[PDB]
C-alpha cells in the first residue's frame, strides 16, 4: 500500500498526538503513573517516564523514533525524557495550520534550525556562574525540597546550614582543574548526645574509635603530626609461642623510629605494645574500621598496607606511609568518643555527626542521607546551571518574538509558532498541580515581557529576572530561592534532540508498507 | 417498572433539561434560541415565555412548567430560580432512593424542613423598605429585577423604570385598602434606530401610526376635546334595515353625491362643539379625510381594541357605538398633543403635563438591533411586576441575594438536623446540599473555577467569634470577579438583593414541584 | 481520557461486590462455578479471591494487596477491600461531575488517615497482656466455629507460653525499642508430631527430632549428653581416615554425636567404644536452632571444631516410644509439639493455632483493644463530621465523603442481620455521642445493644492496618489515569 | 459544546462567501435566487439578503449587516468577516477549558481601548495643503485606479465631482444620482446631465418629429390613460338595419374628446406617465411642440416630481396650473440606435443623471459599480471632516496597541485580547489575496516599518510594496471604523452566548 499527500501527513500527527497524550500524565514529580499490560497479563507500577517508552508497544515509524529519543536521552543525561517528547510532539500539532497557509515544509524545518542555533546564544545570557553566596544561602532550599517527604524535613532548616558549609571545603580540582564536588565526601556517623536542635558540624574528618588507655594526653604535637595507617596487627595471631611476640616487637620499634604519633590497628593493640606508647606520648587506637582507613589514606596521603611482600625487609617505611596532618585535638563529645582529623594536605572529604531521638531512626537517616545529598552534589557537579520550573521556556518565548521580525522570508511565522510551542511544558505541569493552567501561563508571560524591556539598556530598578512556577504551593516564586536548578547540558541536548526527531517526521511525505 | 428505574427515568429526562435553566439566571448565563412556528427567531431570558413556545408532551416536565407560571403571574421574579431549585431536589434524592428509602420520608422530610426554613426568613431581614416611592429609593428594589439581562445596560435602564413607577402610583397616605399600581397600564414601545441614551419617560401611550391627514398636531391649549368613535365613518343610515342595493343607474348619482352631504353634515355638528380630535377604532373612508382637513381636526386611528379600554381612564373619553351623536359627557380632555420624531420616523405623541393625572405611562426605547429590543421590553414588564409585591404582605422586607442567603442558610439547616431525632436526619442534611447548586452555576457562567468560589463562600460565613452577637459581614455573595484582584465584595454596595416576597413564595412552589414528581411512581400514556 | 478513571472504580467495585456479604461472622457461603464442572462451597473470603479470573488490570492489584494482609493477619482481609471500595463510590461524582483534581482527593485521604488514627487511639481501652483469662475471650474470635472449640481451654495455654517465651522488652531510647520484640517466623514455627493427646499437649523449648537410634545395642539413658554439630559427615573424603575424623571429636570425649548427613556403618564401630550416641539425618534449616539451644559452634571441617561447645541445659535423654515411633526430647526459642489422635486432626489445629497466635501477638504488640461489630467504624465517622467544619478548604468535600464509607461496615452487618438498615443506622449514630462509643451491634439477635455485656473487643493494630492499607489501596487506583496494552 | 462547534462552521461558511468580495479588486460571487434571476454583486449587504439562511447564527450575521448598511452604508462586507473571524479564534479555546464568557468579556475591553485610538489617528484637515476643487478630485482617482478606466479616468473625475456639487452638501444620498447605461460608443465621450433621464423603452411609431431643441416645455404628470383605447373590457352591440351598419362603426371617437379638449387648454409640452401612451396622440403634439414618451418606469417618475415640482392628478379636470414646470434646455441623442430623453437646466432639481458609454453592456456594468465606490468617498468627505488612513494603515495599528496593553493585564484576558489582535490580520490578508499579491510576504514585510513608530504605513494596491497610503490618496471615514468594531463584537457576543439551538417546525 502507498499513501501520499496530506492524508498521510494528518495521520502521522494524530498518531504522535495519541502517543503524546499518554505520557502527559507522567510529566513532573506531581504527575501520575501508569500501568503497562502485556499479552501475558502482568503489569508494573512506576513513576519514571524513561522506562515507560521502552516497555510501551507502539507500531509506527515515528513511534520508534521516540523510543530511540528516550534511549539517547538516558545515555547522555537521563532527565527530561517526558519533556523532550512533548516538545517534539507540539511542533507536529502546530503544523496543521501551516498546511492550510501554503507553507512549504522545508521553510518550516529551515526556520527551526535557524532559531535553534540562535537560541544557543540566548541561553548564554541566562546561564551564569554560582552567585548569591554572601548575605544569604541559595543552596539550603535545593535539598529541602527532596527532604520534605521525610521526618528530617522538619529540622532540615537548622540542618541546612551545616550541609552547605561542609560541601564548600571539599571542592577540589579533580583532574586538570575541573573544580567539581566529589560525591565521596561528608562521612556519616551516628551518635545521640543531645536534643535534635543541638547537632553540631565538624569542619573536617572524624574517625570513630577510642583512645584505649586514657592515661595518655588527648592533645600532642600541635604544630605537626603524622598518622600511620597500618592494617597489620600488633597482637600475636595464628598463621614458638613467644616467637610471634618477638616479630611484632621490632615492628613497634620501627614506629617510634619513624616518628608516627598516631597508631591505627584494626585488630587492636596488646598491653605490652601499649605500655611503650605511653612513655613515647603516642596515642594508640584499637579496633579500627577497614572502610574508614581507605579514605584516610587518600586524605592524609598515606597507603594502606596489610602485609609486607617485599623480600625479607621488615620495617614501617618511614616517611613513605606517614601522612600530613597539622594538628589533632579531642574534646568532650557528651557520652561519645571519637578522634578528629583536620588540616591535611588534600582531603576532599568531610564528616558530620547525625543526631536524633534514637539510633533506630539514625539507621534510616544514614542511608537516606545519601539520596538527599545526591540532589545537591549532582546539581553543583556541573559549573553551568540554569533555573528550571519553566524559566527556560518562558525566557526563550520573549527573545523569539523580536527575532522573528529580523529575519522574515516566511520564517517569521515558523519562529512565532516555535516560540509558542515551548509554553506547553508549563501548561501541562499546571494540570497536575490542580491550579488553573490558563492563569499560570498567562501571568508568567506578563512578568517576562516587561523584564526584557530594560534588559539591553543594562539598567534596572524594579525589574528582576528568574520568574518561575512553583507546583507545590501553586504560586509564582523565584526558582533561585526555591532551590530548583537544572544544568545547561541537559537543556541544550533536550532541545537539539527534540527538533532532530521532528525533522525526520516532517520530511516523510509518503508511507509505503509492503 | 421500578426494576428498570422508572423513577430515575423521570429524573433523567428532567436532568437533561435541567442544564438549560441553570444558565438562565444570572447576567453571565446563556440563552437558548427557539424558532417559532411562524418563522421568526425568538430568544429571551425568562423561562416562563420559552416554556410556552416549546411543545413538550412529557407530563413530568409540565409539573415544573405549571409551577413556573406561579412565579411569572403572581410574582415578577423567580421564574428561573424555581426551575433550578426544583430540578436539584430530584438529583439529590437519588442518594436516598439507592439506599432503599421510601418516597414518604423524602416528602415528609421536605415538609418538615419547609416550616423550619420559612420561620428563619423573618430573622434574615435586616432593613425594611419605607415605600417612599422616591426616584432614588426605587432604584434599590428595581435594579436586581432588571439585572441578569443585557448586562451593562442596567445603569441606564434603572432610571427609566423607576421614573415610570412613580408616575403610575397616585399620591396617597395612610391608606392600604385600595390598590394603586396596575401591570397592564404600562406599555413599552420599540423602534429600530437611535441609541440608548436618547430614551426618556413620557406620561401617556405613544402612538407610532401615521397622522393620516394634513393636520400633524393640535395647538398648545390645555384640555383638547377627544372623541372616540367605535363605528367606522360612513354615510348616515337607519338602524332598522337600511341596506343599500343597486338596481337602476339613476340611483348611482344619489349614492356618490349622498355620501358627500351626509358625512360633511356630521362633521360640521361635531366641529361646532369644539372637538379637535376624532378617534376611529375602525377603518376611515376616503371622503372623511377631506373634510377633516378644513375643519382642523386631528385624524387618529386605533386598530387595537385592547388599548381602547385603557384609554378611557387616561383622557376620559367614552366609545360610542353609534355615529353622529357628539355627547359632551363622553368627551375627554388632554392638555398637550404634539408630533415628534421617534426612531427616525414622524409619529404623533400623546402626553400631558399636570392636570388629569393618569396611571398610564410609556417608556420610549431605541436601538439598532431588533432582537435586543425584545428582551429589554420584556424586562420592563418583569421589572414593574415587582411593584405589586411591594404592598402590605411583606413588601418592605428584604434579604441579601447573589448567593449570600443560600450559603448562610446552610449553617442553620444542618444545626436542626442533629436536633430533630428520627429518620428525618437524612432528609434535612440533603435539603441544605440542594441549595449549593445556585452558587455553583453563578461561578460556571462567569468563567470562575468550581474549586475557587465554593470554599471561599464557606470560610467567609463561618468564623470563630467569642460572643453571641454575630460580627464582620454576612452579606458576602458570589462575585462575578473579572476585575479588581481577588476575593469577593459586599453585595450591598451595588444595591442588589432578593426581595423576601420573591424568595419566601418561591420556597413553597419549589417544594411542591418536586413533591409531585417524586410522588408519581408510574405513568401511562399513548403513542402520539 | 476519563474512561480509564471510570474503569478503575468499576474494577474495584466488581472485586468487592463478591465479598459484600462475606464480611462478619454471619458471612454466608458462596458457590464458585469452575469451567471443569467443580464447585467451591467454602465461605472463606480470601480463599475464593485467588481463584477469581479477572480482566481489568486494577482487579489484579486488589488481589495482591489482599494476599499481603492475609499473611500478616488471618482476618480483616475483606474489610480493607470493602472500606477502600466504598471510597471510590462516594468520590465518583466528585471526580467527574464536580471536576475535582485527583491528587487533592489523594492528599485529603492522607490528612484524613492521620486524623483517623488519632480517633482509634482515643477509643482504645487498656488491657493486661499478662492476664491469661483476658486472652481467652480475645483469641476466641479465631477459636469458635472451629473444631478447637472443645479444647479452647487448653489451646489458650499453648499459645501464651510460646509468645511470652520469645518476647524481650529491652526498653531504651538509645537503639530504639521494639515493644515486646516477638519473632513468629523462626521461633514460633510449629512441627506436627503424630500421636499423643491434645489435653496433655505442652509447649516444649528446644529442638525435637523424630530419628531413632542407628545402633541395635546402645544405652537408652544418658546423664548429660553434649550436642556436637558438624557439616561434612563421617566417610571417606579408608578405615584410618574415618577414625582420624572421629579422634578430633573424641578429643573432648563427647557423650553425644549428631551428624547432619548420614553415617556409614564403619563410623558406628569407632564411636561405639567412645560412649557416645550417633544421630544422622538432620535437616540444615534446623541446624541454626540447635546452635541457639545448645551453643556448639557450627564448623565445616572436623579438624577445626572448637572445644567451646557445651551440652548444658539438657532435660532428658529418654528415647521412650510415643505413638509407635521413637522420639527425642531436648526440652531463646521454643518448639510447639501438637499431639492428637490422628494426622487429620493435627493438620486442622496447625493452621488454627498459627492464626490464633497471630491474633495473640496482635494484642501483645498494641496493649489496647477496640470495639468490634461495627462500633469502631461508626465511632470514627462521628468524629469526621466534627473536624470537617474546621478544615475550611477545598479538601472538605472529599473529607466528608469518607464518613459515608466508614458507615458501610456497620451497614454490612445489618444487611446480614435482616433488619431495616436506614432505621438502625439512624439510631445507632446518636448512641455514640452520649454513650462513650459503648453501643455496638449484636450479630445473633440483631437489635442494637451495648458491648459492655458481651464484651467483644479486638486489638488496635488490626484496626490501624485496616484503615492504613485501605487508603493506600484506594489512592493507588487513582494514581493510574491511563491504561495501555502491548509488550 | 457540540452545538457550539456546529455554530463555528456555520459562521465560517458565510464568511468564506464574503472573503473574495472584499476590496475593489476582489472577486464577485454568483448566487442563483429562487426567482431564476442572475444577480452578481460584490456588496456584502445584497449578498447576505439573497441567501436567506435558516441557521440562527448565520442569520445574525445577515441582520447585523443590514444595521451596518442603514446607519452607515459602507463596510457591510468587512463587518461580517471581522465578526466571523472571532469564531475561529475562539474554537481552540473551548477545547482547552476556557469558557466563552471570559472571551466575550475581553472583547468589550479591547474595543473600548480601540475606539480611543481611532480618534487619535483621525486628523481634521480641510484647507491645509489642499484646494476646494482638487480635494474631491483626488479622492475619485483612488477607487478608479487599477481598473480598465484608468486611461479614461481623467475625463471621468470631472463628471463625478460635478454630480456631488450639483446637490446640497447638507443632504446627500447615493440613490439620488441616476445612472443609465448606453450600449455602444466610446467611453471618453460620456457627458454629465443636470436633470433626469430614463431608458426610453418606447419602440412604436411617431419618430422624425419632436426635435431635440426645446425652449421652455411644460411638464405635467399623468395618472390615467389619455388614449381612448380600452384593452380589457368590451361590449356587444348589434343592429338588424342595413343602412345602420355604417353608423354603428362611427361612434366611440367622440367619447374621450370631451376630456381630451381640456389637455389642449393647459398647454403642457411634456407628457409622462407610468403607463404606456397610445400611438394615437403622437402627431398633434408635434404641431404644438408638445413632447410625449410612453413606457416609462415608475421609479423614474418620482424624480420628475422632485425636479420641476410637479404633481400627479387622477383626471384632467382638477389639474391646477401651478403644477407645471419647465427646464432651461432639452437634448436628445440617437447614439446607440436608440433615442434617449434627458432634461437639462433645472434649478429646482433635487436629482441628476450621469450617462455612461462603452463597448458592451457587461463592460459598463463594471464601470458603474466601480464609480459607486468613488462616490461614497467623495460624499463622506464633505459630510464628515474626520477621516482615518485606510488600506492596512489603521487595521495594523489597532492590533499593535493591543499587544502592548495585554502585557500589563493579567489572567485569561491577556491571550483573549491577543487573539482579537491576531483576528484583525484577516482584513489585510484577503485584500492582498484578492488583488493577486502574496499575503505571506507582505505580512512579514509590512510589520518591519510598522514598528518604527509611524502608524500611517499602509499597503499599496497598485504595485506590490510597503509604504504610506498618504501618497496613495486612500482616505476612509472614522464612523466606519468605529461602528465596525461595535457591530462585529455585538454580533459575536450573541452567537457565543447560545449553547443550545432549538428549532420547532410549524
**Which CATH number does the domain housing residue D266 bear?**
3.50.7.10
**Same-domain pairing of D201 and D163:** no
CA distance C11 to A502: 39
**Same-domain pairing of D363 and D330:** yes
For residue C446, which of C473, C468, C424 has the smallest C-alpha distance? C424
CA distance A87 to A106: 19
Chain B: nearest CA to D105, how far in angstroms? 8
For residue B231, which of B297, B292, B279 has the smallest C-alpha distance? B279
Torsion angle of alpha carbons C188, C190, C195, C201, nearest 10°?
Answer: 20
CA distance A177 to C66: 57
C-alpha cell at A215: 592515661
| Long-range CB contacts (within 8 A, 24+) of B350-356 | B350/B204, B350/B205, B350/B206, B350/B207, B351/B202, B351/B203, B351/B204, B352/B203, B352/B204, B355/B222, B355/B223, B356/B314, B356/B315, B356/B316
Which of B447, B453, B486 to mutate to test binding with chain D, by most D CBs within 10 Å of its CB?
Answer: B447
Among all residues of A, which ones are annotated catalytic? 48, 81-82, 371
Environment class of residue D185 by beta-carbon count within 10 Å: exposed (0-12), middle (13-18) or buried (19+)?
middle
Start-to-end CA distance of chain C, whole Å, equals 21
Region for residue C281 given its phi and psi (left: phi exceeds 0; alpha: psi -120 to 50; beta: otherwise)? left
Environment class of residue C106 by beta-carbon count within 10 Å: exposed (0-12), middle (13-18) or buried (19+)?
middle
- Residues 87-126 in B contacting C (C-alpha not used; CB under 8 Å): 99-101
Domains, chain A, in order of start with CATH, read 1-130+384-514 (1.10.560.10), 131-202+348-383 (3.30.260.10), 203-347 (no CATH)
Q: Is D411 in contact with A443 (Cβ distance < 8 A)?
A: yes
CATH class in words for B129-203+356-396: alpha beta
H or E element in which residue C126 lies: strand C125-126
C-alpha cell at D12: 465560517
CA distance D278 to D228: 8
What are the start-end ranges of the H helices in A24-80?
A: 50-55, 61-76
Amino acid at each position: 500500500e502507498k499513501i501520499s499527500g496530506d492524508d498521510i501527513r494528518n495521520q502521522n500527527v494524530l498518531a504522535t498526538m495519541a502517543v503524546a497524550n499518554v505520557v502527559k500524565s507522567s510529566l513532573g514529580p506531581v504527575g501520575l503513573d501508569k500501568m503497562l499490560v502485556d499479552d501475558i497479563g502482568d503489569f508494573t507500577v512506576t513513576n519514571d517516564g524513561a522506562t515507560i517508552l521502552s516497555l510501551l508497544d507502539v507500531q509506527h515509524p515515528a513511534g520508534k523514533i521516540l523510543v530511540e529519543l528516550a534511549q539517547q536521552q538516558d545515555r547522555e543525561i537521563g532527565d527530561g525524557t517526558t519533556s523532550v517528547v512533548i516538545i517534539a510532539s507540539e511542533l507536529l500539532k502546530r503544523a496543521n495550520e501551516l498546511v492550510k497557509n501554503k507553507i512549504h515544509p522545508t521553510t518550516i524545518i529551515t526556520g527551526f534550525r535557524v532559531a535553534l542555533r540562535e537560541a544557543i546564544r540566548f541561553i548564554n545570557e541566562v546561564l551564569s556562574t554560582s552567585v548569591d553566596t554572601l548575605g544569604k544561602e541559595t543552596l539550603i532550599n535545593i535539598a529541602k525540597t527532596s527532604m520534605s517527604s521525610k521526618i528530617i524535613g522538619a529540622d532540615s532548616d537548622f540542618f541546612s546550614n551545616m550541609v552547605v558549609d561542609a560541601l564548600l571545603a571539599v571542592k577540589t580540582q579533580n583532574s586538570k582543574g575541573e573544580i567539581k564536588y566529589p560525591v565521596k565526601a561528608v562521612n556519616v556517623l551516628k551518635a545521640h548526645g543531645k536534643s535534635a536542635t543541638e547537632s553540631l558540624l565538624v569542619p573536617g574528618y572524624a574517625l570513630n574509635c577510642t583512645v584505649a588507655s586514657q592515661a595518655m594526653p588527648k592533645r600532642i604535637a600541635g604544630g605537626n603530626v603524622k598518622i600511620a595507617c597500618l592494617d597489620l596487627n600488633l597482637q600475636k595471631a595464628r598463621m614458638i609461642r613467644k616467637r610471634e611476640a618477638g616479630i611484632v616487637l621490632e615492628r613497634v620499634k620501627k614506629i617510634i623510629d619513624a616518628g608516627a604519633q598516631v597508631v591505627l590497628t584494626t585488630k587492636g593493640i596488646d598491653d605490652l605494645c601499649l605500655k611503650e606508647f605511653v612513655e613515647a606520648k603516642i596515642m594508640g587506637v584499637r579496633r579500627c574500621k577497614k572502610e574508614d582507613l581507605r579514605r584516610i589514606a587518600r586524605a592524609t596521603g598515606a597507603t594502606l598496607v596489610s602485609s609486607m611482600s617485599n623480600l625479607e625487609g621488615e620495617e614501617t617505611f618511614e616517611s613513605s606511609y606517614l601522612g600530613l596532618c597539622d594538628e589533632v585535638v579531642q574534646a568532650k563529645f557528651s557520652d561519645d568518643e571519637c578522634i578528629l582529623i583536620k588540616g591535611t594536605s588534600k582531603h576532599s572529604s568531610s564528616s558530620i555527626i547525625l543526631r536524633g531521638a534514637n539510633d533506630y531512626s539514625l539507621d534510616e537517616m544514614e542511608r537516606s542521607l545519601h539520596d538527599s545529598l545526591s540532589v545537591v552534589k549532582r546539581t553543583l557537579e556541573s559549573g553551568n546551571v540554569v533555573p528550571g520550573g519553566g524559566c527556560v521556556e518562558a525566557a526563550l518565548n520573549i527573545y523569539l518574538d523580536n527575532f522573528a521580525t529580523t529575519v522574515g522570508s516566511r520564517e517569521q511565522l515558523a519562529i512565532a509558532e516555535f516560540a509558542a510551542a515551548l509554553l506547553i511544558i508549563p501548561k501541562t505541569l499546571a494540570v497536575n498541580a490542580a491550579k488553573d493552567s490558563s492563569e499560570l501561563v498567562a501571568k508568567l508571560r506578563s512578568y517576562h515581557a516587561a523584564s526584557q524591556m530594560a534588559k539591553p539598556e543594562d539598567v534596572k530598578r524594579r525589574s528582576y529576572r528568574n520568574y518561575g512556577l512553583d507546583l507545590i504551593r501553586g504560586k509564582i516564586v523565584d526558582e533561585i530561592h526555591a532551590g530548583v536548578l537544572e544544568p545547561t547540558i541537559s537543556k541544550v541536548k533536550s532541545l537539539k534532540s527534540a527538533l532532530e526527531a521532528c525533522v525526520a517526521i516532517l520530511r516523510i511525505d509518503t508511507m509505503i508498507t509492503v | 417498572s421500578n426494576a428498570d428505574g422508572q423513577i430515575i427515568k423521570s429524573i433523567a429526562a428532567i436532568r437533561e433539561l435541567h442544564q438549560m435553566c441553570l444558565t438562565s439566571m444570572g447576567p453571565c448565563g446563556r440563552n437558548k434560541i427557539i424558532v417559532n412556528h411562524l418563522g421568526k427567531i425568538i430568544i429571551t431570558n425568562d423561562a416562563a415565555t420559552m416554556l410556552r413556545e416549546l411543545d413538550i408532551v412529557h407530563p413530568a416536565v409540565k409539573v415544573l412548567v405549571m409551577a413556573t407560571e406561579q412565579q411569572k403571574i403572581d410574582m415578577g421574579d423567580g421564574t428561573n430560580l424555581v426551575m433550578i431549585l426544583a430540578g436539584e431536589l430530584l438529583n439529590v434524592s437519588e442518594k436516598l432512593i439507592s439506599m432503599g428509602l421510601s418516597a414518604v420520608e423524602i416528602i415528609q422530610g421536605y415538609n418538615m424542613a419547609r416550616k423550619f426554613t420559612l420561620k428563619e426568613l423573618d430573622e434574615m431581614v435586616v432593613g425594611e423598605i419605607t415605600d417612599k416611592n422616591d426616584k432614588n429609593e426605587l432604584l434599590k428594589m428595581i435594579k436586581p429585577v432588571i439585572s441578569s439581562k443585557k448586562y451593562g445596560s442596567e445603569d441606564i435602564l434603572s432610571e427609566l423604570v423607576s421614573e415610570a413607577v412613580s408616575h403610575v402610583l397616585p399620591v396617597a397616605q395612610q391608606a392600604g385598602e385600595i390598590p394603586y399600581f396596575n401591570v397592564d397600564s404600562i406599555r413599552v414601545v420599540k423602534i429600530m434606530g437611535g441609541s440608548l441614551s436618547n430614551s426618556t419617560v413620557i406620561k401617556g401611550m405613544v402612538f407610532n401610526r401615521e397622522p393620516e391627514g394634513h393636520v400633524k398636531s393640535l395647538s398648545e391649549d390645555k384640555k383638547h376635546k377627544v372623541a372616540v368613535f367605535t363605528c367606522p365613518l360612513d354615510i348616515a343610515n337607519t338602524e332598522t334595515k337600511g341596506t343599500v342595493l343597486l338596481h337602476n343607474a339613476q340611483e348611482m348619482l344619489d349614492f356618490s353625491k349622498g355620501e358627500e352631504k351626509q358625512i360633511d353634515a356630521m362633521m360640521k355638528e361635531i366641529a361646532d362643539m369644539g372637538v379637535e380630535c376624532i378617534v376611529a377604532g375602525a377603518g376611515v373612508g376616503e371622503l372623511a379625510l377631506h373634510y377633516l382637513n378644513r375643519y382642523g381636526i386631528l385624524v387618529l386611528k386605533v386598530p387595537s381594541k385592547f388599548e381602547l379600554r385603557r384609554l378611557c381612564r387616561v383622557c376620559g373619553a367614552t366609545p360610542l357605538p353609534r355615529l353622529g351623536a357628539p355627547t359632551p359627557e363622553e368627551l375627554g380632555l388632554v392638555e398637550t398633543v404634539k408630533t415628534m420624531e421617534i426612531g427616525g420616523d414622524r409619529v404623533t405623541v400623546f402626553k400631558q403635563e399636570q392636570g388629569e393625572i393618569s396611571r398610564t405611562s410609556t417608556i420610549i426605547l431605541r436601538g439598532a438591533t431588533q432582537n435586543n429590543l425584545d428582551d429589554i421590553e420584556r424586562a420592563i414588564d418583569d421589572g414593574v411586576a415587582a411593584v405589586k409585591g411591594l404592598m402590605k404582605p411583606s413588601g418592605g422586607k428584604l434579604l441579601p441575594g447573589a448567593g449570600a442567603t443560600e450559603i448562610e442558610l446552610i449553617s442553620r439547616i444542618t444545626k436542626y438536623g442533629e436536633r430533630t431525632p428520627g429518620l428525618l436526619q437524612l432528609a434535612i442534611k440533603q435539603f441544605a446540599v440542594a441549595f449549593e447548586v445556585v452558587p455553583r452555576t453563578l461561578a460556571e457562567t462567569a468563567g470562575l473555577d468550581v474549586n475557587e468560589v465554593l470554599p471561599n463562600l464557606y470560610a467567609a460565613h463561618n468564623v470563630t467569634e467569642p460572643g453571641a452577637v454575630k460580627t464582620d459581614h454576612l452579606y458576602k455573595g458570589v462575585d462575578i470577579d473579572g476585575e479588581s484582584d481577588e476575593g469577593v465584595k459586599d453585595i450591598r454596595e451595588e444595591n442588589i438583593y432578593d426581595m423576601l416576597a420573591t424568595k419566601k413564595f418561591a420556597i413553597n412552589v419549589a417544594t411542591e414541584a418536586a413533591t409531585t414528581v417524586l410522588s408519581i411512581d408510574q405513568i401511562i400514556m399513548a403513542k402520539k | 481520557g476519563r474512561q480509564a478513571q471510570i474503569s478503575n472504580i468499576t474494577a474495584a467495585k466488581a472485586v468487592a461486590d463478591v465479598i459484600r456479604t462475606c464480611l462478619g461472622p454471619k458471612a454466608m457461603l458462596k458457590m464458585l462455578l469452575d469451567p471443569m464442572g467443580g464447585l467451591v462451597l467454602t465461605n472463606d473470603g480470601h480463599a475464593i479471591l485467588r481463584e477469581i479470573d479477572v480482566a481489568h488490570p486494577a482487579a489484579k492489584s486488589m488481589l495482591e494487596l489482599s494476599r499481603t494482609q492475609d499473611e500478616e493477619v488471618g482476618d480483616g482481609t475483606t474489610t480493607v477491600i470493602i472500606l477502600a471500595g466504598e471510597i471510590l463510590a462516594q468520590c465518583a461524582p466528585y471526580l467527574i461531575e464536580k471536576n475535582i483534581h485527583p491528587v487533592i482527593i489523594i492528599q485529603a485521604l492522607k490528612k484524613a488517615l492521620t486524623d483517623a488514627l488519632e480517633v482509634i487511639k482515643q477509643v482504645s481501652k487498656p488491657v493486661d497482656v499478662e492476664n491469661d483469662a483476658a486472652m481467652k475471650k480475645l483469641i476466641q474470635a479465631s477459636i469458635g466455629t472451629k473444631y478447637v472449640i472443645h479444647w479452647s481451654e487448653k489451646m489458650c495455654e499453648l499459645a501464651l507460653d510460646a509468645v511470652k517465651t520469645v518476647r524481650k522488652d529491652l526498653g531504651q531510647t538509645v537503639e530504639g525499642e521494639p515493644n515486646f520484640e516477638i519473632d513468629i517466623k523462626r521461633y514460633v514455627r510449629v512441627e506436627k508430631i503424630p500421636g499423643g493427646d491434645v489435653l496433655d499437649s505442652r509447649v516444649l523449648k528446644g529442638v525435637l527430632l523424630n530419628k531413632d537410634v542407628v545402633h541395635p545395642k546402645m544405652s537408652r539413658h544418658i546423664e548429660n549428653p553434649r550436642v556436637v554439630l558438624l557439616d561434612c559427615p563421617l566417610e571417606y573424603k579408608e578405615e584410618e581416615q574415618v577414625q582420624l575424623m572421629c579422634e578430633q571429636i573424641l578429643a573432648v570425649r563427647p557423650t553425644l554425636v549428631i551428624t547432619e548427613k548420614g553415617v556409614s556403618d564403619l563410623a558406628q564401630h569407632y564411636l561405639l567404644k567412645g560412649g557416645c550416641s550417633v544421630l544422622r539425618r538432620v535437616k540444615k534449616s534446623d541446624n541454626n536452632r540447635i546452635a541457639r539451644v545448645t551453643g556448639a559452634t557450627i564448623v565445616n571441617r572436623v579438624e577445626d571444631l572448637k572445644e567451646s561447645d557445651v551440652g548444658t541445659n539438657c532435660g532428658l535423654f529418654k528415647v521412650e516410644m510415643i505413638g509407635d515411633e521413637y522420639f527425642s526430647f531436648l526440652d531463646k526459642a521454643c518448639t510447639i509439639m501438637l499431639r492428637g489422635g490422628s494426622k487429620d486432626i493435627l493438620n486442622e489445629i496447625d493452621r488454627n493455632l498459627q492464626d490464633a497466635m497471630a491474633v495473640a501477638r496482635n494484642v501483645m504488640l498494641s496493649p489496647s483493644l477496640s470495639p468490634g461489630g461495627g462500633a469502631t467504624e461508626m465511632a470514627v465517622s462521628v468524629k469526621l463530621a466534627e473536624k470537617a467544619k474546621q478544615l475550611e478548604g477545598i479538601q472538605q468535600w472529599p473529607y466528608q465523603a469518607v464518613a459515608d464509607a466508614m458507615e458501610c461496615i456497620p451497614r454490612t452487618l445489618i444487611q446480614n442481620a435482616g433488619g431495616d438498615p436506614i432505621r438502625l443506622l439512624s439510631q445507632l449514630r446518636a448512641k455514640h455521642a452520649q454513650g462513650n462509643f459503648t453501643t455496638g451491634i449484636d450479630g445473633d439477635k440483631g437489635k442494637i445493644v451495648d458491648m459492655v455485656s458481651y464484651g467483644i473487643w479486638e486489638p488496635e493494630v488490626i484496626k490501624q492496618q485496616s484503615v492504613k492499607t485501605a487508603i493506600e489501596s484506594a489512592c493507588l487506583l487513582l494514581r493510574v489515569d491511563d491504561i495501555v496494552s502491548g509488550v | 459544546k457540540g452545538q457550539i462547534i456546529s455554530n463555528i462552521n456555520a459562521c465560517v461558511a458565510v464568511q468564506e462567501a464574503l472573503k473574495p468580495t472584499l476590496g475593489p479588486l476582489g472577486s464577485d460571487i454568483l448566487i442563483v435566487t429562487s426567482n431564476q434571476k442572475t444577480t452578481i454583486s460584490n456588496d456584502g449587504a445584497t449578498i447576505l439578503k439573497l441567501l436567506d439562511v435558516v441557521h440562527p447564527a448565520a442569520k445574525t450575521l445577515v441582520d447585523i449587516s443590514r444595521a451596518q448598511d442603514a446607519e452607515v452604508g459602507d463596510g457591510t462586507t468587512s463587518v461580517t468577516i471581522l465578526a466571523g473571524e472571532l469564531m475561529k479564534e475562539a474554537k481552540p479555546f473551548l477545547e482547552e477549558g476556557i469558557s466563552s464568557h471570559l472571551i466575550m468579556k475581553g472583547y468589550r475591553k479591547a474595543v473600548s481601548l480601540a475606539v480611543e485610538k481611532i480618534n487619535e489617528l483621525a486628523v481634521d484637515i480641510t484647507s491645509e495643503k489642499s484646494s476646494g476643487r482638487e480635494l474631491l478630485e483626488r479622492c475619485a482617482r483612488t477607487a478608479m485606479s487599477s481598473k480598465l478606466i484608468h486611461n479614461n479616468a481623467d475625463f471621468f473625475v470631472k463628471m463625478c465631482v460635478d454630480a456631488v456639487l450639483s446637490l446640497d452638501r447638507n443632504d446627500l444620498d447615493d440613490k439620488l444620482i441616476g445612472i443609465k447605461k448606453i450600449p455602444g460608443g466610446a467611453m471618453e465621450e460620456s457627458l454629465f446631465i443636470n436633470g433626469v433621464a430614463f431608458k426610453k423603452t418606447f419602440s412604436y411609431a411617431g419618430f422624425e418629429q419632436q426635435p431635440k431643441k426645446f425652449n421652455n416645455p411644460k411638464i405635467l404628470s399623468l395618472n390615467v390613460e389619455l388614449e381612448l383605447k380600452a384593452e380589457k373590457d368590451n361590449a356587444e352591440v348589434r343592429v338588424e338595419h342595413v343602412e345602420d351598419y355604417q353608423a354603428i362603426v362611427d361612434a366611440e371617437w367622440q367619447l374621450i374628446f370631451e376630456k381630451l379638449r381640456q389637455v389642449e387648454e393647459t398647454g403642457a409640452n411634456i407628457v409622462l406617465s407610468k403607463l404606456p401612451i397610445g400611438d394615437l396622440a403622437t402627431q398633434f403634439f408635434a404641431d404644438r411642440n408638445i413632447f410625449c414618451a410612453g413606457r416609462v418606469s415608475a421609479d423614474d417618475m418620482n424624480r420628475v416630481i422632485q425636479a420641476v415640482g410637479g404633481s400627479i392628478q387622477s383626471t384632467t379636470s382638477d389639474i391646477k396650473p401651478e403644477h407645471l414646470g419647465t427646464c432651461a434646455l432639452f437634448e436628445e441623442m440617437q447614439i446607440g440606435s436608440e433615442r434617449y430623453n434627458l432634461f437639462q437646466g433645472c434649478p429646482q432639481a433635487k436629482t441628476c443623471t450621469l450617462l455612461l458609454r462603452g463597448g458592451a453592456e457587461q463592460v459598463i456594468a463594471e464601470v458603474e459599480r466601480s464609480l459607486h465606490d468613488a462616490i461614497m468617498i467623495v460624499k463622506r468627505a464633505l459630510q464628515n471632516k474626520l477621516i482615518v488612513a485606510g488600506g492596512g494603515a489603521t487595521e495594523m495599528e489597532v492590533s499593535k496597541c493591543l499587544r502592548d496593553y495585554s502585557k500589563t493585564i493579567a489572567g485569561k484576558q491577556q491571550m483573549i485580547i491577543n487573539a482579537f489582535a491576531k483576528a484583525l490580520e484577516v482584513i489585510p490578508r484577503q485584500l492582498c489575496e484578492n488583488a493577486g499579491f502574496d499575503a505571506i510576504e507582505i505580512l512579514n514585510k509590512l510589520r518591519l516599518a510598522h514598528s518604527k513608530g509611524e502608524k500611517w504605513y499602509g499597503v499599496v494596491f497598485e504595485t506590490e510594496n510597503i509604504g504610506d497610503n498618504f501618497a496613495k490618496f486612500v482616505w476612509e471615514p472614522a464612523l466606519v471604523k468605529i461602528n465596525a468594531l461595535n457591530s462585529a463584537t455585538e454580533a459575536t457576543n450573541l452567537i457565543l452566548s447560545v449553547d443550545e439551538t432549538i428549532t420547532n417546525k410549524g
